Design a protein around this ligand. Structure first.
Ligand SMILES: NC(=O)c1ccc[n+]([C@@H]2O[C@H](COP(=O)([O-])OP(=O)(O)OC[C@H]3O[C@@H](n4cnc5c(N)ncnc54)[C@H](O)[C@@H]3O)[C@@H](O)[C@H]2O)c1
Ligand SMILES: NC(=O)c1ccc[n+]([C@@H]2O[C@H](COP(=O)([O-])OP(=O)(O)OC[C@H]3O[C@@H](n4cnc5c(N)ncnc54)[C@H](O)[C@@H]3O)[C@@H](O)[C@H]2O)c1
Ligand SMILES: NC(=O)c1ccc[n+]([C@@H]2O[C@H](COP(=O)([O-])OP(=O)(O)OC[C@H]3O[C@@H](n4cnc5c(N)ncnc54)[C@H](O)[C@@H]3O)[C@@H](O)[C@H]2O)c1
Ligand SMILES: NC(=O)c1ccc[n+]([C@@H]2O[C@H](COP(=O)([O-])OP(=O)(O)OC[C@H]3O[C@@H](n4cnc5c(N)ncnc54)[C@H](O)[C@@H]3O)[C@@H](O)[C@H]2O)c1
Ligand SMILES: Nc1ncnc2c1ncn2[C@@H]1O[C@H](CO)[C@@H](O)[C@H]1O
Ligand SMILES: [K+]
Ligand SMILES: [K+]
Ligand SMILES: [K+]
Lengths: 458, 459, 458, 461
């Protein structure tokens, strides 16, 4: 009962799992610590995390505690066929597949909900994009009563869930595991300072030392990425709208500049400050806004400059005017060449042009695999610990006199994160000093924890 | 004028330092200019207890220029600078502080701060850093407490005392957590220690740091600042922590996590200490703020001629009381001591079995140096001033009994004021911020002018 | 005739040659300067450096002045198929492809000398490593009558030239281009620094922030490698045999240790500091010596360790040990898994293996592309200058009386290198101040002549 | 005899002596020579003249010289570079010295003359140890009669080396001299890392200014220039480099710096129109590391941004135009070694001026003026090399040789590399590092004896 295209590729995926499993000591520590206790015995879960080589390890930890899972996908493209087949090669049925059919990933989801005609006894839901949440709440209202908790990991998907609580029909407590410190720090400031320079140097094979680059935004992603260039000898300037992030940039050794004169964006050609644009060799966008690099900027920029993007959306740079006015030429599968001569008819070589690296999209995926396995360790143990927490309280088994008391969406409490951090530190080989009772009394916390309040920003 | 300073001749030098320092702190000068006509502190009375360096003088002077009259003393024994005290006292302003005092003189400073001519001062707010002055007010003189509108706290260890008194209801007047603003926690705790730590070490020991090995205890904000101050000079740094989150961050920043005790278990016996690791470290810095984090049995197993100093706010992190009973002390120079091991009655003048200790385990950046640059103190003194502005308008003591029941709590400053302070800080460096267009602001769900981040944002 | 992997990549190649032409201002300036006179009319060159994009640009510059060239691969895993095909499309026979074999590596050199069944009338020589020079000097010395000079790129070559000069078996003058400042303090120091971590990531996909490494040797290449591994958050230590280099490393912020107790190496298993090797994760050797990593340290290394090497010859690591007692498994090109159990057989579930990069040869070229264009520009400008200088003398057409006075190893003067440095500076947009007559008189040099004396170490 | 000294005072000896006894553990190489050569005393009968800044480390060097059987007299190389405590400590030990702080050039010349003149009569010296060639040039100028008995001279700085080279080129030098600046453990150790260690400390303790987010301009990219540029960056500073040498500019560009010129296109003519006034209007800190003349002209201090900091790290003061300052603008002091320069005029002074200028150490050495110089572990190698050079040259006996052989012994030479390796090896062991030793196979393959030296004479490191 599998839809995976090719099942014979399991051994390749098996050894890829084996090499990938070693670099994720968190899940190994969770498997060792809770072995023999079996805290997930009798649990039935259905979920749709994006299928990759690490996702196959994530399922392996869950089944090690005695759970039964049926699997699907949250998108169309993020699914490695050989790894999914390797999971299918075991006793776990899987349905994720790279069929490239947008009208067919919905029908794949329908098979996990119902085994054969009759619906399945679902206790926990491990959602990624929130579409499973909506399909359960809309098409099968009767199954929701036997659900203990759901788990969501995405951006602005929790935003939809929070508002749906106010509008009613949400009868199950939910966890906002996205706000974990470990996962937040691993996702933004660490996975970037390792992959930005690698993707750039793979795409262009240029030399960075001595050149000048401009960075838009100094948020989490912008700070994590701004230090991948200054450590290479580049001279870096920062652009921002939030004064506090600008102050942090000033105190960190950078310089803050504005593309428009006086920072005012009037829209006329007189607003563009061409003086500073005649010395720039590279522009990066780290913000999540829209049209932060407009059409007027790209005319006044210095020749042969490079262009790239890190934000999730693609409308940071005015690609519509660029496609409407200037012609494109391809250098290699993911590098493009755009001239400013005219609509068509460029020479073999020219002196007036620019360069794009990901046709205005996410550079981390176009040029490279993405984050490594070590960094993505934290984001996958939070899910498991949260399932542990929600499986024991048994919301669905409680009578109606306390449904209103326990019906809310919350975040993961501080204690469970520290366990993951301790396991990760033990992965590196570090050692932690246990507190004597006198010192714990002096600082007024328990020996086991927690060590910090909820108003603390690490 | 209450003349009590070590020397008075040093006023002019402090005056020139004050003139130069004003050009350094632009946000505070701009606040003074903008709030010059409103006089939002008309009739405000303050008590002051903070480090008496040259930066605090401009804050005191703007407080005076905004219609407030105040009294001051030093938070710590080794904090005052004589030129600043002389220059400020030359302006007809009472103050009581100098450098190198004793514990009895230290407490006499507070008892002079809160008393005048045998009668209690008619103070309406209190400014405290350290929490000792609050304890003196609360314990011995409860009769003046109800006349208080609020108190400002400058450091974390004071906030701990405020919270523990709030838990048992001993706190009777509300307080503002000044130490919580983003322009405070991510500026003073981190960047200033980074600028100041190596300066004090060099001014005290003159030792070369490149190629040596050091151990830093704790990885909070002060720990991060210290690690940055040390590694940038070319050292080999190791960090010890009790919070797993901070250990993970230390592993992420490129440092190593080690524990002096075997298996991280403090057994207390002389055997549990991992003497192999301590037989290589040349410098120890304590950042935790806990008590007795530097055990007596670890000090006996260190390398000869090792350096010991403290950056925390208390002197209980190092077992300096154990040394004073068993080992002999000789003074190299002011604030520098050689402690010879294995003996008390005397020391061989050429003996090599000794240690060097700086500032007797107290604050190291203040006792041995000047502390922080004014460019850093500006971002804190602005929040202090604004918090006092907000606090004075409440007039807590004049509310009816019912209102006081729902007004006794702790809280923070709004984000808009902090963003204004940051904006005025940035422009001093010569930078330019870009303003949004209405379409972008409506896209990100934010106004053109106002807060840009939600409350749960960790920055 | 020729043999390359494929030729259809000539369009993409030519696009990359055009884009790389813009990042080498010095070579463009010299090609513009000498195109109108062609000093190399009739000059014939037989070169054997690495065949890459820069090398193709160098060949184009050589043929732009009227020369005739032939080429072959310098290392077994260094050539680029696209660049070789693009140059072969220009009318120059070339023999180089990836995945070559040691016996087949000799095949390339044998036919670059022979033309249509006869040896060719080569006049000048370019080599990188001295492997072709020994073949020339060892089998048939009848070529050296008409050869005007020999040029060497690397330090090992110069060592071999001097070792031959000790015996007096050398018969042709050589001009040293290695010891030029614009080459020694640029190529070794900055190319390896800019490329080593990228080559590591292109093949490991690990997280380098929070690991342990050891780098052996602290030369210019060693300094570059140590600075390269610093910026990735790694923890590194330096082992040296030279007191001065050890002092410099100690002053740079490293820990200096040796894998031997008190430094004494005798061969017994009891002479190895087993504790230190039990926690190291990555090892890189940058020495140029023999038996730098003996057999006994490979037995006492920590599980799951990565082995790296950027030496020209494969004598740093005792590979015969593995080939005679251990078994290898390949996960992907230029990466193998070497188990420490036996050569008979193994299982995938074991954890007693080692990870090796590029089978122990140069990983800068084996696992990556190599140096960028802007770094090779400075080397190729000096190469072209020395190439033009030596031909004008016409050594091979002189009587023995003047032949006696010319057998010598010479270098380029100081003044010529300063022009190349000036051209490289203006590529970044910088401006160099001009000395006034008074200042020039006071210092003791002419207003525009060489400024530093011959003994300056820089 | 010993009584005739002149220092700040006496009482600082007890504390100074503690500083020396602390420093003895910080300099292993010098103590290694002290232990090795004290049993045979190869310096007996030497009468050494000396001129280098008086500090703690130089006091330990003087103690090392006496421990081998020397009779030395010492003085000041720089006007502001003395230390009171070490000067008091050495004086009470029986070795006469003449050095204090905040003197005038008359007193400086008086001390220089008095060091070489004993009881009104020229002193029958056999050795000279100068720094900068001042004392060496005096003898060729006023006392030509001392040079028939003087065995040799030693030189420490680059400017002194250049002066001796010019003297030899003109054919007026009389006595052979050895330059110790060219040794690897001197050129690539003292000039670079010590300037790195001591640059920002002087700024930090002279002005107490934050260095994050500021802009500075470093002129010159020698060894000292490289060290200073590396010292400024590590504090979080955006700094710029200018030069006249293309190769060093290429190195600076590769390092991660921007190369600009303080003139419109690099051509200077003395006209104000040639100044790149836009760039100089936003620069806060200036450092000159050239040793040339007039690298900071009047039109740079007439066009700089207000409230900027000015410094010099080269040997001599003429590198910047102080003479313009002394007669066009007014001066006022805030603290010792710090000043205020006002561009409004030489009168009309008022404390609330907003376009003032700040100058550090009056254009002399700032690492030794506003700070206490390099640490002991760096000066260890330089002093060990100096004492080794003195020991080696004392064994040749140039004065007593016949004039026929004297013609072939007049040159400027450098020490053999084996002594450099000995110094470096004993320096390393003060850190804890362990140096590997070669097996016969590796020694034969490399082609170098197991005992050193392992590198040719053309290596640059
Ligand atoms: N792995 C990845 O590539 C990855 C991961 C998570 C998020 N992201 C994306 O990165 C973007 C931001 O990430 P973040 O966590 O740093 O966000 P953030 O919440 O920290 O905000 C980004 C910053 O951009 C600033 N900004 C907004 N408009 C601007 C403008 N007009 N000019 C200059 N600065 C402006 C904001 O003030 C903020 O400081 C989003 O699009 C997010 O989806 C990427
Ligand atoms: N000198 C200064 O400039 C300065 C400035 C601000 C605060 N302080 C003082 O420093 C102290 C601590 O600084 P903070 O409050 O900013 O830091 P912090 O609140 O972030 O916590 C200090 C760190 O020490 C750790 N720690 C506690 N006990 C430990 C133990 N036994 N072993 C190892 N680690 C342990 C904690 O987990 C925490 O990470 C306070 O008393 C504060 O008042 C000094
Ligand atoms: N990978 C590349 O891109 C590249 C480029 C050029 C040269 N190389 C090769 O690298 C090698 C060395 O490079 P280099 O020119 O910088 O060398 P180098 O001449 O500058 O010296 C190498 C260093 O290794 C040290 N060393 C020698 N034997 C040692 C031992 N047994 N233990 C420890 N240290 C030892 C030496 O003292 C020296 O400091 C040569 O074989 C050269 O051909 C590699
Ligand atoms: N303060 C200290 O502790 C200390 C220590 C050692 C040396 N020094 C002094 O430093 C000085 C020089 O040091 P060094 O030996 O590294 O010098 P250096 O000779 O090695 O380099 C001087 C640099 O100045 C540049 N230069 C010269 N004139 C210039 C001009 N007009 N404009 C721009 N650049 C110009 C040259 O191109 C060169 O790069 C000497 O006078 C020496 O006495 C001071
Ligand atoms: N020189 C100084 N002037 C004023 N406040 C200081 C100084 N040094 C430290 N502080 C502050 O005093 C507190 C010490 O714990 C912190 O808030 C720290 O930022
Ligand atoms: K200060
Ligand atoms: K290439
Ligand atoms: K010193």
């Amino acid at each position: 009962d599998y839809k995976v295209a090719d099942i014979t590729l399991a051994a390749w995926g098996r050894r890829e799992l084996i090499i990938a499993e070693s670099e994720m000591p968190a899940l190994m520590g969770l498997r060792r610590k809770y072995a023999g206790q079996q805290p997930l015995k009798g649990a039935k879960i259905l979920g749709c995390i994006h299928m990759t080589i690490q996702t196959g390890v994530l399922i392996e930890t869950l089944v090690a505690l005695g759970a039964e899972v049926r699997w699907s996908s949250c998108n169309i493209f993020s699914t490695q066929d050989q790894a999914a087949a390797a999971i299918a090669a075991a006793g776990i049925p899987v349905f994720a597949w790279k069929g490239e059919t947008e009208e067919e990933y919905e029908w794949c989801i329908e098979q996990t909900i119902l085994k054969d005609g009759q619906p399945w006894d679902a206790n926990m839901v491990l959602d990624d994009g929130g579409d499973l949440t909506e399909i359960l709440h809309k098409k099968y209202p009767q199954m929701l009563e036997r659900i203990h908790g759901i788990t969501e990991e995405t951006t602005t998907g929790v935003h939809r869930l929070l508002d749906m609580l106010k509008n009613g029909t949400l009868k199950v407590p939910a966890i906002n595991v996205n706000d974990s410190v470990t996962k937040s720090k691993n996702d933004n400031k660490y996975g970037c300072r390792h992959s930005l320079n690698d993707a750039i140097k793979r795409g262009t094979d240029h030399l960075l030392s001595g050149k000048q680059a401009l960075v838009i935004g100094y948020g989490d992603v912008g700070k994590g990425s701004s230090q991948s260039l200054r450590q290479e000898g580049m001279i870096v300037k920062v652009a921002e709208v939030d004064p506090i992030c600008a102050m942090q940039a000033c105190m960190d050794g950078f310089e803050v500049v504005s593309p428009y004169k006086n920072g005012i964006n009037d829209g006329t050609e007189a607003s563009i400050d061409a003086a500073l644009l005649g010395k720039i060799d590279l522009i990066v966008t780290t913000t999540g806004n829209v049209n932060v690099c407009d059409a007027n900027m790209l005319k006044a920029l210095k020749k042969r400059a490079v262009v790239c993007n890190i934000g999730h959306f693609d409308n940071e740079i005015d690609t519509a005017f660029m496609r409407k006015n200037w012609a494109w030429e391809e250098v290699k599968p993911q590098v493009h060449k755009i001239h400013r001569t005219g609509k068509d008819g460029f020479d073999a070589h020219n002196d007036d042009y620019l360069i794009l690296l990901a046709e205005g999209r996410l550079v981390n995926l176009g040029n490279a695999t993405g984050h490594p396995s070590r960094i993505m360790d934290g984001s996958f143990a939070n899910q498991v610990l949260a399932q542990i927490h929600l499986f024991e309280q048994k919301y669905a088994d409680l009578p109606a006199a306390e449904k209103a008391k326990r019906l809310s969406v919350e975040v993961l409490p501080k204690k469970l994160d520290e366990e993951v951090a301790l396991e990760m530190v033990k992965g590196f080989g570090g050692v932690v000093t246990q507190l004597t009772p006198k010192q714990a009394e002096y600082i007024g916390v328990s020996v086991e924890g927690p060590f910090k309040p909820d108003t603390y920003r690490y």
